[PDB]
Amino acid sequence: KLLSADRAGYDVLVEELTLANIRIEHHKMPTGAFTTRWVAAKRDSALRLT
Amino acid sequence: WLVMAATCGGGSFGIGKLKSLCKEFSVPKELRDALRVKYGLFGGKDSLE
B6 contacts in A (CB within 8 Å)? Predict the structure, then answer.
């Protein structure tokens, strides 16, 4: 009893302008420096998302 | 640095100091403890009548 229907449807456109402016501050490509820790010692690295 | 810090952060307790280059006197620096006590043992070395 599968009922997904494709059209189916759608568309648209426109433009515008106005203006205004505013402032903050900037947004639109921020880089995040995640830090992982499992014992007293720690590793840290940076990544980006659009 | 507060994230690596976790539960305890921004809680300075004691600050040690040291020389960058090496020369003359070694200078491992935490004798400041006996600086507020300006002349604890040095004032009276071996004075006796």
Answer: 37
Q: Which of B1, B3, B7 to mutate to test the interface with A (most CBs of A within 10 A)?
A: B3
Between positions 7 and 46 of A, the ones with CB within 8 A of B are 35, 37, 42, 44
CB–CB contacts below 8 A, A to B: 6
Q: Is B3 helix (H, G, I), strand (E, B) or coil?
A: helix
Q: What do you get for the CA distance between the two ends of chain A, in Å? A: 39
Beta bridge partner(s), residue A5: none
What resolution does the deposited structure have, in angstroms? 4.1
Q: How was this structure determined?
A: cryo-EM
In the structure encoding, which two tokens stand for residue B36, read together?
């507020």
Compute the distance between CA of residue B21 and CA of residue A38 in angstroms, rounded to an integer: 36
The sign one gets for the Cα dihedral B17, B28, A42, A50 is positive
